[PDB]
């Protein structure tokens, strides 16, 4: 390395991702204080040789050879110019391209080697689902699927699935292919209910035709108030005076776990009744009415259905 960093400025994604058979599109801009370029060489994994004071390694593009040939056919194309643009294109990209790309540039009196890492996986890597840390029932959440890839030669699509079924909601797909970031994003608005807790949400990466490429899956953690099931003995809730009545309050689902329970009779809170079992001994005709239980967790309180107790 015999370069003066004050003579060069570069703006590019410092790491780009792709997979075998796809393509990579590398946005890149630069400014050379020493003037226009006189030569550009694209190395793959360059190594500086102290003997000849030169860089050894595989040359993927040479301005003196490839820059004189019709390049529309070529796999490796330099789409830049002499003063401001260093954009690269590799179509198709191969696993052997994985490593660091060496942008060897020379002005009239200055030389520089700008390095960009290219991570190519053998298989298409999965996207990444991003969820809010807190999801509760009846809340509208934006499901975000992020893929750190985008290239013009290889269009793709992100498909949202809920329990293996494509989601009916429309998704908004956005792409960025700039010197700052390269990604494909999909956003889907979605209002989960309590029944979506524990279900599987899938974001599939597909090609332009719809062939499966990869997928990321998340198991939804959906907070919800306790869903209650109330039972009464006797079953018909019809008694006569003096008999005993037992009502129980079962939590069929709660996220997070319940913390308290109370009982109500015709809208009136039953004091000293803070367990999941209500026992009425020697019932009078005044104890007739509509009974229900209420159970609360961190989300909020829930209520069971009403039992119409009748004292004949
Ligand atoms: C450095 O300089 C180079 C060349 O001057 C610039 O490269 C151009 O970049 C633009 C995008 O920034 C490219 O436009 C895209 O073309 C894609 C298809 O390319 C066809 O056309 C080119 C010729 O223009 C052919 O060579 C090629 O074989 C194809 O036939 C489209 O798919 C793209 O459309 C997508 O993006 C647009 C928004 O940009 C959306 O509206 C579309 O819906 C779609 O999503 C896009 O139009 C252009 O092709 C590139 N030129 C060349 C010759 O390759 C670099 O941008 C520049 N670097 C910087 C950092 O500015």
Numbering used by the authors: 17 to 328
Article excerpt on this structure:
One of the best described Siglecs is CD22 (Siglec-2), whose expression is restricted to B cells. CD22 plays a critical role in establishing a baseline level of B-cell inhibition, and thus is a critical determinant of homeostasis in humoral immunity. CD22 is a single-spanning membrane glycoprotein of 140 kDa on the surface of B cells. The extracellular domain (ECD) of CD22 is comprised of seven immunoglobulin (Ig) domains (d1–d7) and 12 putative N-linked glycosylation sites.
To facilitate crystallization of CD22 ECD, we created a truncated construct that contains the first three Ig domains (residues 20–330) with five of the six N-linked glycosylation sites mutated to alanines (5A: N67A, N112A, N135A, N164A, N231A). The three N-terminal domains of CD22 are arranged as beads on a string and extend ~110 Å. As expected, d1 adopts a V-type fold. As such, d2 of CD22 buries 721 Å2 of surface area on d1, which is substantially greater than that for Siglec-4 (684 Å2) and Siglec-5 (461 Å2). The N101 glycan is positioned in a hydrophobic environment at the d1/d2 junction, burying 348 Å2 of surface area, which helps explain its importance for CD22 expression. As predicted, d3 adopts a C2-type Ig domain topology. The CD22 V-type d1 domain displays unique features compared to other Siglec family members: (1) the C–C′ strands are elongated and extend into a β-hairpin (hereafter named C1 and C2) that shapes the Sia binding site; (2) strand G is continuous, without a loop insertion; and (3) the C′–D loop protrudes away from the core V-type structure. Overall, the complex and unliganded structures of CD22 are highly similar (Cα r.m.s.d. of 0.35 Å for d1), indicating that carbohydrate recognition by CD22 is largely mediated by a preformed binding site.
